[PDB]
Design an enzyme around this catalytic site. Sequence first.
Site, PDB file in Angstrom:
ATOM      1  N   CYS A  58       0.827  -1.201   0.000  1.00 29.88           N
ATOM      2  CA  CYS A  58       0.000   0.000   0.000  1.00 29.88           C
ATOM      3  C   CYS A  58       0.865   1.256   0.000  1.00 29.88           C
ATOM      4  O   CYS A  58       1.898   1.311   0.665  1.00 29.88           O
ATOM      5  CB  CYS A  58      -0.928   0.005   1.216  1.00 29.88           C
ATOM      6  SG  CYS A  58      -1.977   1.472   1.338  1.00 29.88           S
TER       7      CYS A  58
ATOM      8  N   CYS B 246       0.764   4.440   3.533  1.00 34.44           N
ATOM      9  CA  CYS B 246       0.928   3.662   4.756  1.00 34.44           C
ATOM     10  C   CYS B 246       1.084   4.575   5.966  1.00 34.44           C
ATOM     11  O   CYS B 246       0.614   4.262   7.060  1.00 34.44           O
ATOM     12  CB  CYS B 246       2.142   2.738   4.638  1.00 34.44           C
ATOM     13  SG  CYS B 246       3.695   3.601   4.307  1.00 34.44           S
TER      14      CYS B 246
END
Length: 110
Positions: free
Chosen positions: A35, A38
Site C-alpha cells: 500500500c 501507509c
Amino acid sequence: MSEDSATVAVTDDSFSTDVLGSSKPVLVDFWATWCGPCKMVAPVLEEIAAEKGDQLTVAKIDVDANPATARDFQVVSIPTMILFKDGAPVKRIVGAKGKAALLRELSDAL
C-alpha cells in the site's frame, strides 16, 4: 507508559471460522502489503485499534493472500475497513482518510 494488546491478524482461510466462529464483535481492515499511503493511515489504525480495542478486536487482512481482489480492478492499495458483529456484516467504510473517518465506525457500531 504502556500500549494495548488487543490486536491480532487472522488468516484468509481461517477468517470466517474465526470471525463467524466468534460470537463477540470482530473488526477487520483490508489493505495491501505494498500500500502507498501507509503513513497517512499508519497512526490511524493504531489509535483506532486501541480506541475500541477493548470493546472489540481489530485485525487486518493481507492482500498478498487475496490478490484476486485488488487485481480485479488493478488496485495497488485497498485502504478499506469492514466491521463484523455476530458473525455478520454491520459496517463497511472505504477510503484511507483521517482517523476522524474510521472513528465513525465505533460511533455507529457502538
